């Protein structure tokens, strides 16, 4: 088991950063019978899902962590068969409807309504045998849901609130439509500070007995993660493995392959500006997209790497950021991402 998962806290008392959010969650869990629907938003890797699980464990018993995966079948209007992998616990349920793309709507109309419109048999911690509690459903990547899928949630939340409570988790709130944001309690989850990341990494190292020349190592790893705790833990594990469980002052910071590819693409764009260069850039973009690298991630990293070049002037950076904004909007409204990425690269080449 990786260190990132082997030391994840399992209770609200085990959280070790953003104590204000911990106190707010404790206040919410103090009287959970009237808990409204929740929407947790914040940067990636901060610990939103961990906090959601801790809140559920505070509301219900420790038994929320006994998860089991099952398969649910769905039929479309064309008779096409679809399968959804649902993670469930004796107290809560989890769904990721975006896994079915435009078909996610069916979930909101078939699965969720099935959970909320019927009572559930509870033969544990109960005397009659029927659950005397509401069911908590967790929708992950809620920002990836289609607009109609989100619209299908409105009356479901407003009618069966006595039996179903929804805890949605998202990285950005802009894709969420206004009615859904109005129907939920919004919880901001700030990213951990560098000191807290360093403390967590120090605790992990001490538990794993990884030799450290100086603590400043953990500082640099914290800075390279840009506030992402999961990335910090995985990077620490990778460096420890590559340095025989011993980190020295000269230990390099390991970056993932796709970041290196994007940086090489940025260097190539800066060096050469022509149509042949654009053809090779198209080849690189196809290679990146064929390996499950999202287009929006590619655009963001490419834009920031270009803006972090010590050879361009203010006008070039302004043009680059403007084009990045325009083509990010284009990507949000389009289907073929390669077209928009190529257009952005061509515009950047023209401006430079």
């Amino acid at each position: 088991s990786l260190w990132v998962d082997k030391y994840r806290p399992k209770s609200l008392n085990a959280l070790s950063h953003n104590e204000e959010l911990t106190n707010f969650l404790k206040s919410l869990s103090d009287q959970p019978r009237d808990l409204p629907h929740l929407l947790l938003y914040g940067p990636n890797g901060t610990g939103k899902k961990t906090r959601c699980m801790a809140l559920l464990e505070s509301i219900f018993g420790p038994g929320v962590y006994r998860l089991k995966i099952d398969v649910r079948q769905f039929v479309t209007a064309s008779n096409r068969k679809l399968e959804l992998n649902v993670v469930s616990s004796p107290y809560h349920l989890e769904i990721t409807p975006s896994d079915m793309g435009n078909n996610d709507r069916i979930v909101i109309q078939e699965l969720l309504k099935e959970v909320a419109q019927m009572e559930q048999v509870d033969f544990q911690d109960s005397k009659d045998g029927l659950a005397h509690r509401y069911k908590c459903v967790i929708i992950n990547e809620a920002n990836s849901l289609t607009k109609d899928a989100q619209a299908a949630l409105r009356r479901t939340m407003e009618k069966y609130s006595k039996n179903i409570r929804l805890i949605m988790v998202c990285d950005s709130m802009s894709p969420i439509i206004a009615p859904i944001k109005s129907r939920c309690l919004l919880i901001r989850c700030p990213a951990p500070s560098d000191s807290e990341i360093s403390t967590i990494l120090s605790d992990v190292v001490t538990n794993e007995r990884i030799q450290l020349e100086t603590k400043d190592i953990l500082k640099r790893i914290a800075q390279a993660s840009n506030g992402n705790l999961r990335v910090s833990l995985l990077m620490l594990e990778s460096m420890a493995l590559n340095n025989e469980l011993a980190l020295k002052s000269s230990s390099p910071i390991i970056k993932p392959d796709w970041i290196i590819v994007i940086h090489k693409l940025t260097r190539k764009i800066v060096k050469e500006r022509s149509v042949n260069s654009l053809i090779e850039c198209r080849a690189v973009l196809y290679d990146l997209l064929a390996h499950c690298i999202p287009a929006n991630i590619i655009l963001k990293e490419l834009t920031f790497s270009l803006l972090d070049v010590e050879t361009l002037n203010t006008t070039n950076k302004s043009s680059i950021i403007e084009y990045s904004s325009v083509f990010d909007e284009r990507l949000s409204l389009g289907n073929k991402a390669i077209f928009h990425l190529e257009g952005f690269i061509a515009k950047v080449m023209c401006c430079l």
Binding site: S88, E114, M118, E119, V121, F123, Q124, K127, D128, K162
Partner: protein
């Protein structure tokens, strides 16, 4: 080390067929007493309980209780190739990755021996502690099948109103409503189709039509089905076996207008 020689394998076929739709992965505990099983539905709204006593089997023995997580679909596949009137046995070994199903017959030629793989399913300590159910009745399985297949066309929700000396069925839908009132019934010349009832406090419970249809799919086991209704607890439908029974605890549809 364990065998369950059956009087007729068709009984086991029907037993497995009676709850295949509700659940597919169910833990079966085999003890010298017999076969037991309790599986919660994937939606956590229905529970399938099963038990076959030692009496029903032609010859049942076991040296050490053993829990098998064998799949129901695989067992159905194994049985369907079998003959009509045989004496299925469930032999295995100390560390069984599979269970040999001996489809033995009185004749030495009509044999359909097979093998069924076993799955490592997880079992919990489910408790079905008896409750003071307010009402309990028993009526012929054919009548229930007809009533359900009739009312399912007119609606998707079926209300089972058990009041004083009344077994009222209700099904309201878009086209209209359907009600088939049954009353305590006894026939001296054929008491096998006598409606039995015992009722303390009135019980109102509305269930889903699909669940009731799936439950009655397995009503061929017993010519009579027993409905136990409690206001604050999940009502249960029971079909008697040769030496046990198959019970289904179906949760009631939630009431939002109230």
């Amino acid at each position: 080390m364990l065998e369950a020689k059956f009087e007729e394998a068709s009984l086991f076929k029907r037993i497995i067929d009676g709850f295949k739709d509700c659940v597919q992965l169910v833990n079966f505990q085999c003890k010298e007493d017999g076969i037991i099983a309790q599986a919660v539905d994937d939606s956590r709204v229905l529970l399938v309980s099963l038990e076959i006593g030692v009496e029903a089997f032609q010859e049942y023995r076991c040296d050490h209780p053993v829990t098998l997580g064998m799949d129901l679909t695989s067992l159905s596949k194994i049985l369907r190739c079998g003959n009509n009137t045989d004496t299925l046995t469930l032999i295995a070994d100390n560390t069984p990755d599979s269970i040999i199903l001996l489809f033995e017959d009185t004749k030495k030629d009509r044999i359909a021996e097979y093998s069924l793989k076993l799955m490592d399913i997880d079992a919990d300590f489910l408790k079905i502690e008896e409750l003071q159910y307010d009402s309990t009745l028993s009526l012929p399985s054919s009548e229930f099948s007809k009533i359900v297949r009739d009312l399912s066309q007119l609606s998707d929700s079926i209300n089972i109103m058990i009041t004083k000396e009344t077994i009222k069925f209700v099904a309201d839908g878009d086209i209209g409503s359907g009600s088939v009132i049954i009353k305590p019934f006894v026939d001296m010349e054929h008491p096998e189709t006598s409606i039995k009832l015992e009722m303390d406090q009135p019980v109102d419970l509305t269930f889903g039509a699909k669940y009731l249809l799936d439950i009655i799919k397995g009503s061929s086991l017993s010519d009579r089905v027993g409905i136990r209704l409690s206001s604050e607890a999940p009502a249960l439908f029971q079909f008697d076996l040769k030496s046990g029974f198959l019970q289904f605890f179906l949760a009631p549809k939630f009431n939002d207008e109230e």
